[PDB]
Amino acid sequence: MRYAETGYVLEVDLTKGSIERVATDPRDTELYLGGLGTNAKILWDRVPPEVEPFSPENLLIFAAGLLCGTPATGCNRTIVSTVSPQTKLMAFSMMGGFWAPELKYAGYDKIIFRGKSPELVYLYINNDKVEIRDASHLKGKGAIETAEIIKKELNEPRAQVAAIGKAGENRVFYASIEQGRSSASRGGIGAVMGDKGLKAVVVRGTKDLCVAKPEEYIGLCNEVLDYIKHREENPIPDVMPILAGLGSPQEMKVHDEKWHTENFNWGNARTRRKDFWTDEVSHAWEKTMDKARTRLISCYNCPMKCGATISMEGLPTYMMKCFTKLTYTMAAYSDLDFGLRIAQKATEYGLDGFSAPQVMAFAFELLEKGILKDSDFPGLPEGNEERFFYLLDKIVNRDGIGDILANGTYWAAQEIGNGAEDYAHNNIKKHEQLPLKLSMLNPIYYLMYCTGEKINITQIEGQFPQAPYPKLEQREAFVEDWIQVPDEKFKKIFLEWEPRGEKSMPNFPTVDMCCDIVDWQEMMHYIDDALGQCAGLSSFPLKPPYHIHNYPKFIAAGAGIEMDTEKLKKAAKRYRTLVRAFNIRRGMRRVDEQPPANHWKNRFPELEKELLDSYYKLKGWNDDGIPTKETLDDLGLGYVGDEFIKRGILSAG
Amino acid sequence: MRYAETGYVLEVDLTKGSIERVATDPRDTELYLGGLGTNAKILWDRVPPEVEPFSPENLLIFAAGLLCGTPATGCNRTIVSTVSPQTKLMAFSMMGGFWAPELKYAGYDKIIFRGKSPELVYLYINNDKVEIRDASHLKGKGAIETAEIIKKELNEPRAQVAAIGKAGENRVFYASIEQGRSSASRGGIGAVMGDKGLKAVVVRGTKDLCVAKPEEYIGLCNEVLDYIKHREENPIPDVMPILAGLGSPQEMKVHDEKWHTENFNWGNARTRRKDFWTDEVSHAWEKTMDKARTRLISCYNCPMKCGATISMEGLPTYMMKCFTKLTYTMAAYSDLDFGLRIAQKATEYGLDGFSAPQVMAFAFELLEKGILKDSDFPGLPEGNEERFFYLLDKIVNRDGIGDILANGTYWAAQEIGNGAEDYAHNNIKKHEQLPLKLSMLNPIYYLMYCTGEKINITQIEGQFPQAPYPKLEQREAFVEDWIQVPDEKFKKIFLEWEPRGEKSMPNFPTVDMCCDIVDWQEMMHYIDDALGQCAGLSSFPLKPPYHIHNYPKFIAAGAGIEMDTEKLKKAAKRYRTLVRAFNIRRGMRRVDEQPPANHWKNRFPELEKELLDSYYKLKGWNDDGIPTKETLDDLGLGYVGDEFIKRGILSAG
Ligand SMILES: CC(C)(COP(=O)(O)OP(=O)(O)OC[C@H]1O[C@@H](n2cnc3c(N)ncnc32)[C@H](O)[C@@H]1OP(=O)(O)O)[C@@H](O)C(=O)NCCC(=O)NCCSC(=O)c1ccccc1
Ligand SMILES: CC(C)(COP(=O)(O)OP(=O)(O)OC[C@H]1O[C@@H](n2cnc3c(N)ncnc32)[C@H](O)[C@@H]1OP(=O)(O)O)[C@@H](O)C(=O)NCCC(=O)NCCSC(=O)c1ccccc1
Ligand SMILES: Nc1nc2c(c(=O)[nH]1)N[C@H]1C(S)=C(S)[C@@H](COP(=O)(O)O)O[C@H]1N2
Ligand SMILES: Nc1nc2c(c(=O)[nH]1)N[C@H]1C(S)=C(S)[C@@H](COP(=O)(O)O)O[C@H]1N2
Ligand SMILES: Nc1nc2c(c(=O)[nH]1)N[C@H]1C(S)=C(S)[C@@H](COP(=O)(O)O)O[C@H]1N2
Ligand SMILES: Nc1nc2c(c(=O)[nH]1)N[C@H]1C(S)=C(S)[C@@H](COP(=O)(O)O)O[C@H]1N2
Ligand code: SF4
Ligand code: SF4
Ligand SMILES: [Mg+2]
Ligand SMILES: [Mg+2]
Ligand SMILES: [W+6]
Ligand SMILES: [W+6]
């Protein structure tokens, strides 16, 4: 029998209203583990490149990680996968909370949606009971608001609900899916969900979930908890607060945001304010945050409590975590009070807290320059704050100028013209990046910006420190108990690495060292997004409780399959290449893999070419970014190599 | 991980030439075991009643039993299922030999064909490699002949081949599938295969097949091999050799056919020859058999060697077992030399050995009577023997009157008319029966002739004795060591049974007694056809090694699921009802459940009514043969009851 996984999925046709439970192939588990990996397998051989994002044949997959529903601490992530309406590439999005584990308790590993529903509806799951309900009375309702009404309707107080706001219903290219203190935020997956007339997905589960090696599996679980205690008694020395400990960026706990407000760019990723964090500002923000934060809350089976309930006066309560705390504030040249109030509106609407702020600031720059006229913004209010609330409503409704801005900075500038493309200066593969315009070229981050399939920098980094220690004693101390490294050489790299001089960036670490680092950091994220493990306890923070050495044990004891360190490394490489192959088939080439032209002020073309060339070699790809026939056959992806040749993507010989 | 079964099937669309391996649902195994069981499930919810047998939507399935490819002695049966072109009902047909086990070693449980290939093809399976080959150079070739050329083409001497003959290609309604010394013979499965344009299925396998509890399973295997040694040293006293030991009827060993020739109707189930077995006949048949029989051969993993390679002077070699040894002979009022000769042609042509002889025999009665003219048989030889060879050619080619006769006796008489219906007197549901026209009504066999879904009396009988003993001492001796009975009450039945007196047929055994006997006998067959076990070691002979008490142990140790006598009983009841439900949906009713009008000289209309009334009650059926909503709900077949009501077959309460 199957373990960790349930071995079953739901196939839903929203056009015919048909529902079907189908057993999964156990071979898929051995090759692609689960979550993102198996999502990639499904999208590959069911979604050909001729399928458009808002086409009925486009798929919307809700996947619970392999180890979700087990006692594994923090393992609770949902992986939503589809074809992005913004980037035209694959879009996988992660969501925390309690939804994924509930699905497992209901008896399912995934839910795959195809076609479209003519009427607004939501899916109701209660163990073996599955049905489609009408949701017309929920039209326009906010994401969180929607969940509460449903749980009253069905009389299921303990059901978990993933819903879309008005933004998703109106197919905003950066619309999200909201569930309590969790969000599948990026990729426009909310736009696809709305396009299919799917207002929400409600699931309740009370079945058992089994593991293969009970005693052994709980042993590793306790080993993690013990490490979390010890780790939280020994934070990383001389790092900032929101990087010393475990979990997601603890921005709800720490009031200090000097690193953020003085190193990140305000507005449309435009302005840098070196001396913003004054005493008056630090006190005003701490007061606002103490009054707004009700409680620090956690996800399922996790003690880190990264999120927080936010209560602004005269506004409904919503939940928040990580960097969305500042994006609306910094993009509007305002304060933390404004940011918390508009984030409430945006979370209910279901918008990406990264792109949305940059799109609105992008619009005001165009209005400032004169590329957009005041006639495009009728009835526009005077205040800077009021203008953001104004433009926010225009976007979610796709009203007038809001209809164009609802497509993202790339497509909006494309349609606007008149030099609007010049102000879309912060995109990679048509996707907005973090507002960061640094001085000196970073050889490690350059690679992560160019090749990251998530196209987000915060979701590929983690395991290697972002900066070197000034003193050698500090490095020797760090590498002392750095048991998470796959190889001793990662310790030796950090020892030699210095902030200034003959061993500083961009010329050090070397090109070969950078490639190895990027490959390791990326590998841990892909393992996380297949197992369902929150990165906060794994691939994100320094020296995590989960790593390349005990992960194989969790899989073996949990799922009952043969798994070791090397076999796991190869597995992660397998469906990370498959994801790559999916984007190749959709027209992605080396040309698309370049950072923004103004991302760094000091550029080194010859070093950057050597970096991307060497990294491709390590991955086993072409000098155009395409996985060769040799590496594909070696990975067990022969059917990919055949289709590449047949499609002319790869040449025979 | 799955056990005994491989857990995969092959989905092949012949019209599109697509090949696909699909993991199965382990719940189907729990409810329907496998083989014939799971095949019924597949046909039920994929082949609705509006589908024609020669429609491309009709399915042809090759299933290997649950315990095929395991060390279990005699377990190697293939189960072919489809919708019969002759009866318009469900058709399942069993084939022995070496084919099923081979499929298991390749890594598959079933092959499921849909659609029609426009050109003659065959499927080549070698482990993970599966491809469709052009087979136009094989057109017209015989089943066995086709096999040898194919194996040489592929350089695969250890490959197993199931093939159709010309008869299958020309969609003769009783065309068969031949696999060396084994054949799927009845129902017209060869017709559907030819109709789809499938000449053969070649399979080679070299993969491991695992069992769950090794030590316990091989222990069970050793228990059977012991019982076989002891059974062969103790044949059932006062029973003729062919039916006094294990295996299929050993007619290839025993020359003595006094019982058959003097009790079975020669010709068109017409002539009883009470004193046919003379000294001169016996010596002649003995001489022919001794010179013809090259060697007694077995199936995979069995020591009984029921088969015999037959070599007639001037003819190629073929394999034969059981009763075809007499059918062609008796139908033509000929001898054994002719029988063995023509049966070589018939086997290579791919024809059923029960119907062909009766069909040809039926035609000559119509010619003798006047309904058919010499004009219908142009080029008709003068000799009896030469006429049968002539009409055999006409049928396989569907040439002239061979087109009409190729549809069977039921439809032939329907189309011929002019009173030809009267000579189609040996039918049940448009399916030719054994040439048996006894004197006194047998209550036990009456119920079997009416309800058996195979519609063939020899594939439902077995566990209970066909006749009583003259002496009580004989009865007491037999029931002393009769461990295979499901209850003690069977022992008491046999003891009371007498050939003459108050305790003789038709009045004894009683109606309730007769029902319990038919139920037991039928149940054992369905377990065999699901597991893949040969009836010659189970449901066919008296006191077999496999039985209702040790069968659960095999299923548990073999497949690794829970099982016991009562669960197994109900499990067999579940998919016997399912098969019953499939034919009810195709229009079958009580009216169709009647033996030939002249099957018994002495009839008892009132007893016959009570007999069937009672049997329907034990089954849990209506007074019209249809399974009640209750028993369907009780068997976990709730989906069936719903559709029945929806279709109006069952009144809503
Ligand atoms: C200190 C760094 C490492 C880089 O900041 P800086 O120190 O400012 O580095 P700079 O490149 O600006 O150069 C500084 C000055 O020194 C100069 N100079 C430089 N090198 C050299 C040299 N070798 N030799 C000599 N001089 C050198 C250089 O010319 C410049 O001087 P000028 O003004 O031009 O005259 C850190 O702040 C960082 O974030 N980096 C990681 C990358 C990243 O973005 N990761 C975060 C992803 S988001 C995330 O994780 C998150 C988001 C939300 C929520 C949660 C999480
Ligand atoms: C002896 C029987 C039991 C029946 O044969 P018989 O003895 O002839 O039984 P009858 O019914 O013909 O009557 C005889 C005479 O006695 C008379 N009479 C009868 N009852 C009574 C009474 N109670 N009281 C008084 N008198 C009674 C009756 O009137 C008649 O006298 P008349 O001439 O009319 O004046 C046996 O031969 C048999 O095969 N039966 C099993 C059923 C079957 O067909 N199974 C095989 C399936 S194929 C197979 O397995 C296989 C095929 C190929 C390869 C391998 C396998
Ligand atoms: N497995 C996994 N966990 C992850 C992440 C991820 O990308 N993969 N992202 C982290 C970051 S940067 C944030 S801001 C939060 C957001 O969690 P959410 O998806 O529930 O909103 O998740 C964290 N946990
Ligand atoms: N509306 C909204 N957008 C959001 C967030 C959020 O909490 N709400 N979280 C941000 C954070 S912290 C992260 S790490 C990314 C997570 O990426 P993903 O949700 O696409 O996997 O989304 C960002 N966008
Ligand atoms: N499981 C099972 N085994 C069975 C049978 C059957 O119907 N089911 N038929 C028996 C009989 S009567 C005969 S004659 C032989 C025929 O073997 P064949 O189908 O390979 O020609 O199978 C024997 N074994
Ligand atoms: N061509 C051919 N027809 C045959 C046979 C055979 O061996 N070859 N077996 C006969 C016997 S003895 C029996 S019991 C049935 C078996 O039925 P089935 O093979 O359709 O399951 O087929 C009959 N027809
Ligand atoms: S580390 Fe934070 S975001 Fe991750 S599971 Fe724990 S509480 Fe949730
Ligand atoms: S008993 Fe006879 S027919 Fe059955 S498997 Fe053994 S040899 Fe073959
Ligand atoms: Mg998220
Ligand atoms: Mg057969
Ligand atoms: W983040
Ligand atoms: W037989």
UniProtKB/TrEMBL annotation, chains A, B:
Zn(2+) binds at residues 251, 255, 257, 260. It comes from the Bacteria. GO terms for molecular function: 4 iron, 4 sulfur cluster binding; electron transfer activity; metal ion binding; oxidoreductase activity, acting on the aldehyde or oxo group of donors, iron-sulfur protein as acceptor. InterPro entries: Ald_Fedxn_OxRdtase_dom2 (IPR013984), Ald_Fedxn_OxRdtase_dom3 (IPR013985), Ald_Fedxn_OxRdtase_N (IPR013983), Ald_Fedxn_OxRdtase_N_sf (IPR036503), OxRdtase_Ald_Fedxn_C (IPR001203), Tungsten_al_ferr_oxy-like_C (IPR036021), W-dependent_AOR (IPR051919). Mg(2+) binds at residues 94, 183. Its cofactor is tungstopterin; [4Fe-4S] cluster. Keywords: 4Fe-4S, Iron, Iron-sulfur, Metal-binding, Oxidoreductase, Zinc. Residues 6-207 form the Aldehyde ferredoxin oxidoreductase N-terminal domain. [4Fe-4S] cluster binds at residues 299, 302, 306, 534. Belongs to the AOR/FOR family. This is Benzoyl-CoA reductase, putative. It comes from Geobacter metallireducens (strain ATCC 53774 / DSM 7210 / GS-15). The gene is bamB-1.
